[PDB]
């Protein structure tokens, strides 16, 4: 449970 | 900025117990946590997760640091006797540039 989901936000 | 969290990790174990990937001039320009090992300081803290991208270590930016330099900064931050924690500024966002 120490895992993030795929993020739906990206920094460019 | 939006999406960042400052996480203070107590040096509760003999290692940080994370693997990181990335750094300047790679497809992952800021280091990403790829594993959190049971028994390490990071696992004990509960606030760091696989997929976190590390933006700053003790207030020092990792932008522009090559992978080996970023890793060395983190290692030196763990080893130091000046304090009993490491501050990580992390984001859950992907960082692609």
Swiss-Prot record, chain B:
Record domain PDZ: where: 6-89
Function, as annotated: Involved in hearing and vision as member of the USH2 complex. Necessary for elongation and maintenance of inner and outer hair cell stereocilia in the organ of Corti in the inner ear. Involved in the maintenance of the hair bundle ankle region, which connects stereocilia in cochlear hair cells of the inner ear. In retina photoreceptors, required for the maintenance of periciliary membrane complex that seems to play a role in regulating intracellular protein transport.
Protein name: Whirlin
Disorder noted: Deafness, autosomal recessive, 31: A form of non-syndromic sensorineural hearing loss. Sensorineural deafness results from damage to the neural receptors of the inner ear, the nerve pathways to the brain, or the area of the brain that receives sound information. Usher syndrome 2D: USH is a genetically heterogeneous condition characterized by the association of retinitis pigmentosa and sensorineural deafness. Age at onset and differences in auditory and vestibular function distinguish Usher syndrome type 1 (USH1), Usher syndrome type 2 (USH2) and Usher syndrome type 3 (USH3). USH2 is characterized by congenital mild hearing impairment with normal vestibular responses.
Organism superkingdom: Eukaryota
Subunit structure: Forms homooligomers. Interacts (via C-terminal PDZ domain) with MYO15A; this interaction is necessary for localization of WHRN to stereocilia tips. Interacts (via C-terminal PDZ domain) with MPP1/p55. Interacts with LRRC4C/NGL1. Interacts with MYO7A. Interacts with RPGR. Interacts with EPS8. Interacts with CASK. Interacts with CIB2. Component of USH2 complex, composed of ADGRV1, PDZD7, USH2A and WHRN. Interacts (via PDZ domains) with PDZD7; the interaction is direct. Interacts (via N-terminal PDZ domain) with USH2A (via cytoplasmic region). Interacts with ADGRV1/MASS1 (via cytoplasmic region).
Species this chain originates from: Homo sapiens
Location in the cell: Cytoplasm; Cell projection, Stereocilium; Cell projection, Growth cone; Photoreceptor inner segment
């Amino acid at each position: 449970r120490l895992t993030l989901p795929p993020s739906e936000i990206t920094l460019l | 900025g939006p999406g960042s969290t400052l996480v203070r990790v107590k040096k509760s174990a003999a290692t940080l117990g994370i693997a990181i990937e990335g750094g300047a001039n790679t497809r992952q320009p800021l280091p990403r946590i790829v594993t959190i090992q049971r028994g390490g300081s990071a696992h004990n803290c509960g606030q760091l997760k696989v997929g976190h991208v590390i933006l700053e270590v003790n207030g020092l930016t990792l932008r522009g640091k090559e992978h080996r330099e970023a890793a060395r900064i983190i290692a030196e931050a763990f080893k130091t006797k000046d304090r009993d924690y490491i501050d990580f500024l992390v984001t859950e966002f992907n960082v692609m540039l």
